[PDB]
Design a protein around this ligand. Structure first.
Ligand code: R2P
Ligand code: R2P
Lengths: 262, 262
């Protein structure tokens, strides 16, 4: 049929998608700003379509509920036809690639450790060999899944501790993880993707630090329902943007150009 | 029909595919060793197929000849049905994705600068602002194409110089680029992918160094003829291997576990 407005599912995660300071006075797509808001614009331009940005209802990235077997988050929105595409920091994983399509990565990343400055921790091994400093991850997504599945000694040890720790060491959003690290006087370390970690490191009150090397290497991809016609065009659009140096500039724009820590 | 031996096209590039020291006494796939030889084995195991490794005839990665319009190298082998899959450090690019399929990346990289230790160069800008130290790239592939296409000031300036430099600053293979840097007393710098650069840095006589940050960010993908049935299984295989930490171990195995520079 004729062209139709493409429904984009995304998530409120700084600095990918954030509410403009004056969003209360705006409406539609203009309420949002950020790396993925800019990328969405570029993709639509190159693919030739108009779109409506919609924040995922449950605020989740996407996981298959072990109970109901129903996919939640942005992945779910695609799987059940609620949205036509996902433009956000959605990590490309095996379980997800089995149910939806992913474009080649538009950004790279790896699980990392975030500590309050001064915390005596330099690695995952360090965390696994102590109990005074608690640690956790987002309550769902590629990181939690990484630990739940891991057969690597150190990571499995970490998972055994995290899953049974009481009170919970898991958080609902990255913002909550960051807040916990900042208010825990170094007694809480947060495991999240290097990209968000690096961003937060340049935000006031500049009291957090990324320590150690990444535990893995992967990337974010633009997702579409399995078999979607839009998939191929989006993929080529992503590659073109990267080769034009456009993605690199968007990265600098939202991460370092306006860092608040010097 | 029934299963058939899968023809794998690859390229002799250390440490991805190298001739074993005693290859002269061996035959078939057993003549070769390296990261991609190991990856090929893992992919075949996970995808359930047997294969024959064959070194690309022209020794090229793959480019569309401006004259004949014919694709050469490994890309050509796929495009014309000479091979069923390419397992090598083949860079995922737009022009290539338009003619063949690529799995999600199995390794990340970026164009980098290789200098003989001591050379007064720390960046691409540095190179572009001087003439005493000549510089070049492989005579074909994603790096040369990066410069030929680039609209970025500094890189276009570099391309203008390189393309017209006499004698040629381009080389036929990475090995030739490395040799030129090592024998040029610092008067030649080589532009190649960070992965090969980092590998060479840990090889005797340990006289080369990677300097500056990468000029871009991209990845290597396993390639198959456009629409090939093998594509989907290979892609999932790649993701599974990465999530098992297998790719990380292969990287260490062939890059650092046996570095000869400490
Ligand atoms: N990219 C998210 C996971 C994530 N983002 S920041 N910290 C995390 O664990 C996913 O795709 O699940
Ligand atoms: N990966 C090659 C290019 C390359 N490899 S080492 N130095 C280079 O320029 C290609 O896919 O063309």
């Amino acid at each position: 049929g004729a062209n139709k407005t493409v429904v984009v599912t995304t998530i409120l995660e700084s600095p990918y998608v954030m509410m403009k300071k004056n969003h209360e006075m705006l409406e539609g797509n203009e309420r949002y700003e950020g790396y993925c808001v800019d990328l969405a614009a570029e993709i639509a331009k190159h693919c030739g379509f108009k779109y409506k940005l919609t924040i995922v209802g449950d605020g989740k990235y996407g996981a298959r509920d072990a109970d109901t077997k129903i996919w939640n988050g942005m992945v779910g929105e695609l799987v059940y036809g609620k949205a036509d595409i996902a433009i956000a920091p959605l990590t490309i994983t095996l379980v997800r690639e089995e149910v939806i399509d992913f474009s080649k990565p538009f950004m790279s990343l790896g699980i990392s450790i975030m500590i309050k400055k001064g915390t005596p921790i330099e690695s995952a091994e360090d965390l696994s060999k102590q109990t005074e400093i608690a640690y956790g991850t987002l309550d769902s997504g590629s990181t939690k899944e990484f630990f739940r599945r891991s057969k690597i000694a150190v990571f499995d040890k970490m998972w055994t501790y995290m899953r049974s720790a009481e009170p919970s060491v898991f958080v609902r959003t990255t913002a909550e993880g960051v807040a916990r690290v900042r208010k825990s006087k170094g007694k809480y370390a947060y495991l999240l993707e290097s990209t968000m970690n690096e961003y937060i490191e340049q935000r006031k009150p500049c009291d957090t630090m990324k320590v150690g090397g990444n535990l893995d290497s992967k990337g974010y991809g633009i997702a579409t329902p399995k078999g979607s016609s839009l998939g191929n065009a989006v993929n080529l659009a992503v590659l073109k943007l990267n080769e034009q140096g456009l993605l690199d500039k968007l990265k600098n724009k939202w991460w370092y150009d306006k860092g608040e820590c010097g």
